[PDB]
Amino acid sequence: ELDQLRQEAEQLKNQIRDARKACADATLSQITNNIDPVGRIQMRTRRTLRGHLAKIYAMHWGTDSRLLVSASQDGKLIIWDSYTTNKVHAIPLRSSWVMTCAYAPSGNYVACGGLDNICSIYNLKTREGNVRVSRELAGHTGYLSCCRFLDDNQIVTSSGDTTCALWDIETGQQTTTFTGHTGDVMSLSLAPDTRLFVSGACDASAKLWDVREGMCRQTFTGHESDINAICFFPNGNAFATGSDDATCRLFDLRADQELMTYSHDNIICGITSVSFSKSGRLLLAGYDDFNCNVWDALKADRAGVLAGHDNRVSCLGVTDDGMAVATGSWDSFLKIWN
Amino acid sequence: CTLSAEDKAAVERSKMIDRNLREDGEKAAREVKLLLLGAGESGKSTIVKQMKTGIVETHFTFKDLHFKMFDVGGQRSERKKWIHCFEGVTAIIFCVALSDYDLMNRMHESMKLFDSICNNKWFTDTSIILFLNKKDLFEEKIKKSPLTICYPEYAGSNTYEEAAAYIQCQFEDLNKRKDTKEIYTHFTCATDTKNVQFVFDAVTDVIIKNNLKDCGLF
């Protein structure tokens, strides 16, 4: 009888909830009640990266904090020089229907995937002055929603088949497959030491995976709808999700609970993209209402507004030196906000 | 000019990349994108053979106009997480079998996929091209099994010319967006060979009515 195993699994996640309430002695908003607020944050559009012709679906900064790759649905993958607004590369994709892109931390590779279920790694720093597909990673049976490089040889991808996967790039096979989700995994975020990663799915749950062990360490259930965005705190001991029920929630990894909820009554639409700044004091969330809200992460209070996109802000990321924020949108424009 | 010799040559590369983005965007803006959205393989692949893995793009040409049918039946994911990718498609070619009305019901599953995608948020203005195929098999079934199985509120007889006009009107009464989108209905089969002629006529009615909407005339 599996209903006995159903009765034990309902008894066992009460021990999850009771041992999580046994640590909730003081909230984050009680501790940072006696701290000074951030005030008002005035961010200006420094650059507008024009040149895409469709909805920009992802971007990713390089670790040098100057180059960024972006993916749009015109079948292009442009690498931008963000300081002097030059296109470094324009990579034509075999599938126009891309939903993610990643820049390698070495700078030599760019991956992208989408509705074709394939994460194609493109080699930028070749000979020949050309950008060629160095690998295509097949094995996912759903649309590939996110990809992040661990190094030049490993890449974690997530997909709509309720499955994240770790890949070896040269032997293009799944080294590890992360199952346990019951909905389409919409995002992932590696830890700063890249030994763990969190993944948010459409079953309103985030899961913390061990990369080398291959197991689900912790499961975080606090949302009511599809988690579209996830991002690690710069400490690596917390993360912030962003979902379709218009709230961002800050979960920690050690106390195993959520700390804050970043919600307003003026926002009704969901979050597409979540990223902390450097030092984790700011939480920049992009929304469906053409708008990116800067949240003071230690309090709940809203700091300034990154307004200036004519369509839904689909992607955003802060540079690794924390100097700028680039937001892409469904109008074909990437704006850089210092 | 305050740029170095290498930074001036990096601007010239970026301007030459810009020139190839417009030449490849003008080549794609002259193309017609179509989203094929049949319900449970209801003759969805039998009209791909009549023109000329995640999604299957089918390129074909008619009267120097390049079409692209993006069949999305091989996804099996939550549709709401990727159906906004096809927002901006020219039309939605919908395939409904006319012989699944007797087969919870197979025809009511077609009307539910029709109702969700025609009254969708992202397809509030993209016209549906309904394809009521397998009409030859509908002849051999409506003479024995009436339309009272799928449609109990139907008083007309088992003549095909009034039964097919009822299934067309039952599907075309599902758009609440009648002031902004239109539904082009065809009754086809495998033996019908004028179906790419209908798609060329139905999407040139879409692109004309979209150009007249964009030029301020409508």
């Epitope: 100057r66 180059l67 020089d81 002097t84 030059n86 470094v88 590369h89 700078g107 000979r127 020949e128 002055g129 050309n130 | 305050t2 170095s4 010799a5 290498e6 930074d7 001036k8 040559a9 990096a10 010239e12 590369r13 030459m16």
Partner: single-chain antibody, 232 residues
């Protein structure tokens, strides 16, 4: 990737001769291509440059007006139409590819060259040493001093280091100042101070023997130094 040049040969002075540089194994149309000549006892000297897409075309002041550089991208071929040849045009003309974006490595591949024989405001790069006796395994510091600050406002120091081994074409070592080129060993290292620059070979092997040219890329014309020969 290889560049092979054609043309050359004995030419009467005042005549005309067309050099052709057949490119193969790389995306030729996305590269700017240079012509760099070397007189049979002197050092390198930049002649002409045509960009990708033939947008900008530059020449040296010695060859302006009577030389014409042109590319043909479908055949992957680079031309240098030379008319009214003088006795100062007796040289080995190298055909150099160079791509320009952020973080690129210009001047990275050099052609083999065709010896053309005829019958009988510029930044000054100065390498004061002309010949250095070296034993292998030692540490060498080739020095090069400019006549202008090669450091730009964007932070880049446009100083290039080449190594022409005896009997071969030049090979890029250090593309911007302190930027090791791809495929060269880690024992090379560049360093500079805006106007004075050094190239440090840590543990020199037998392959490091040759002439070391410093080139500026701050403005056109690109000028080389009369390089420092290294001898065992």
């Amino acid at each position: 990737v290889q560049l092979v040049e054609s043309g050359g040969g004995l030419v009467q002075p005042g005549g005309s001769r067309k050099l052709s540089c057949s490119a193969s194994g790389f995306a030729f149309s996305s590269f700017g291509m240079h012509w760099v000549r070397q007189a049979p006892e002197k050092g390198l000297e930049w002649v002409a440059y045509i960009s990708s897409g033939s947008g900008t075309i530059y020449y040296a002041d010695t060859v302006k007006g009577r030389f014409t550089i042109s590319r043909d991208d479908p055949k992957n071929t680079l031309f240098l139409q030379m008319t009214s040849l003088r006795s100062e045009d007796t040289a080995m003309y190298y055909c150099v590819r160079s791509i320009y974006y952020y973080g690129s490595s210009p001047f990275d591949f050099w052609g083999q060259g065709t010896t053309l024989t005829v019958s009988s405001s510029d930044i000054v790069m100065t390498q004061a040493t002309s010949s250095v006796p070296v034993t292998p395994g030692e540490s060498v510091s080739i020095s090069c001093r400019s006549s202008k600050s090669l450091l730009h406002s964007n932070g880049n120091t446009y100083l290039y280091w080449f190594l022409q081994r005896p009997g071969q074409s030049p090979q890029l070592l250090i593309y911007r100042m302190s930027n090791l080129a791809s495929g060269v060993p880690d024992r090379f290292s560049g360093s500079g101070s805006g106007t004075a620059f050094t190239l440090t070979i840590s543990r020199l092997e037998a392959e490091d023997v040759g002439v070391y040219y410093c080139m500026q890329h701050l403005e056109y014309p690109l000028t080389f130094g009369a390089g420092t020969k290294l001898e065992l």
